[model samples]
Target chain A: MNSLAGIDMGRILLDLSNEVIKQLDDLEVQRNLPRADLLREAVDQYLINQSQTARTSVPGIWQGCEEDGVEYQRKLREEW
Target chain B: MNSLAGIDMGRILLDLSNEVIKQLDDLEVQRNLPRADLLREAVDQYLINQSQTARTSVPGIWQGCEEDGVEYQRKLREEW
Candidate 1:
């Protein structure tokens, strides 16, 4: 964990296109912040939008995904 | 922000390939947890590995990345 601006931060590995990285670099220069800082700002914005979206809209978001789902669920609950 | 296990979590949009998503799905089933939970586990492991790595290894990790670097640094410091 890393701490900055008094907030504990976690790092994530991201697969970013070269083009997006270039754009990000530009933003960093303009904003005078690290790439991680810029992403934090974007995520903050995205989460707010996501909340508004859930209120406004729409997850079979997962299906064919979990096989033997019932047994697995029971086992997890028992362990809990 | 999202609350899970009493921690306030921030969301991030990840660009994942189909194969990786499939693997993640498989893990979710075996672990009896959501995709997010699997990622959280992976990240926790990764951060621990990263700390060990810093103790062992080495970043120009970003160069040609930030131009006018000195001026930008001064600006941010002044703003702070």
Candidate 2:
């Protein structure tokens, strides 16, 4: 959010409550930063924390879905 | 994988190729860690990097999904 740099950013639709919106706006004013940038950081940090905290291993959790997960990752990585 | 601690970790099914599996084993042998732990780190790092790199601002990207996104977040946040 601070720097888009060379990476082309994509759009996201976030439906926050009006109260939350007002708070974001207030924070933007207080911090002299863009709301989009603030929200981007929020999302980025939230997602990073999620991966760190929520990731776990369940043996055989993929008995049926291993191929599915592999294909999904393959499809996604194809974009890279 | 290393420290489940107080957090009740869940299981995941990853269908990595034999090649990938061997490499994972090699990494575990080399690094003295479990394969699951190594994979957990890989997935965590990948997801964090993905979020950091891919997040962007596209205004109105949620024309129709605002309500959906709201509902989804509401449901998820209710868990917290």
Candidate 3:
């Protein structure tokens, strides 16, 4: 894949195989979720793991385990 | 994040927390890699794992293990 980027946003041209193209389409409809989202979640999860690995590990991502990251962020913000 | 979409393309408005935003930036620069690509790898890996779980598992993705998926695809294409 290739991309165009800026600080607040960017785009990617995914070079997917025909099989991947077909499966992603099916999964999108079957899950009733956007393909972009599934990919976003994948990235989100990936970064979370990468960060965790650098320091060891964490409880989970905001999406995983229903972790209250918003609440934590709110608490963190209160200090500022 | 939120998004805009089409059949072959789409966009996502990543609502990253400031912490994630900072980390992503740092990681991008540190790795000398495009942020978009890291995300792509994340999604690519995610899909491969998901597909595997649905039917068990497989070798890896095109980006992983140096698997010759292009070669395999070429072979498959030759049959057609």
Candidate 4:
């Protein structure tokens, strides 16, 4: 089990990165690209255009991400 | 200002999509892609290959995302 103090920022980012990839795949089907290749191209364009600060910060806060995801889900149920 | 009830889901998603793009851009600079083109391609591949369920949910909850981000920030300051 991962403790708040023992969080692994690198792993969290890798997980987040993988999740984004999953989201992109979903987008491809919904948008109905003429070919998978085109959809792949769009995803590349989107990711490459991201900011450097944000990219570097990804692995800086594993505890924060886990906590944020939890708190966000809680707030969603309560507020929504 | 966008109210909780009057939130624009599409705009929020577009903003988030843009944010992701920014993150990718940052990653490229840090990772030092051989060419901007390669970084762009990697981003596209990551996004396009993503899962379907996740993509459709991006624009579903503007209020939720805002609330989550806020709560997460608050929690971060308090916990960290």
* lDDT score for candidate 2 against the true structure: 0.48
What TM-score would candidate 1 get against the native? 0.33
CAPRI-style quality class for the chain A–B interface of candidate 4: incorrect
How should the candidates be ordered by TM-score, best one leading? 3, 1, 2, 4
After TM-score superposition, the amount by which residue A70's alpha carbon in candidate 3 deviates from its true location, in angstroms, is: 61
Q: What would the per-residue lDDT of candidate 4 be over residues B1-80, giving only the tens digit for each residue?
A: 54633232221011123334444445556677533354345544554555336655556535544343344455457656
lDDT of 3 by residue, A1-80 (tens): 43434344544445444446556766787798977677667768887767654445456556545545544455567658
Q: State which candidate, 2 or 3, has the greater lDDT.
A: 3
lDDT (tens digit, per residue) of candidate 1 on B1-80: 53343333334455444444554555556668776655444434433433454534543175655455444455457647
Better of 2 and 4 by TM-score: 2
Backbone clashes in model 1, listed as residue pairs? none
- Point out where model 4 deviates above 4 Å: A1-80, B1-16, B43-80
Off by over 4 Å in 3: A1-19, A54-80, B1-21, B54-80
Q: Give the candidate order by descending lDDT.
A: 3, 1, 2, 4
DockQ-better candidate, 3 vs 4: 3
TM-scores of chain B, in order: 0.53, 0.52, 0.50, 0.23
Off by over 4 Å in 2: A1-80, B1-6, B53-80
Candidate 1 regions with alpha-carbon error over 4 angstroms: A1-80, B1-7, B53-80
Task: Report the Cα lDDT for residue B75, model 2.
Answer: 52
CAPRI quality level assigned to candidate 1 from its DockQ score: incorrect
Question: In candidate 1, what are the lDDT values of residues A23-43, reduced to their tens digit?
Answer: 556667876986565544453
Task: State the lDDT of candidate 2 residue by residue for A1-80, as single tens digits.
Answer: 47433533332233333454455456678779865555445434544554544448555653443244343443445343
lDDT of 1 at B10: 37
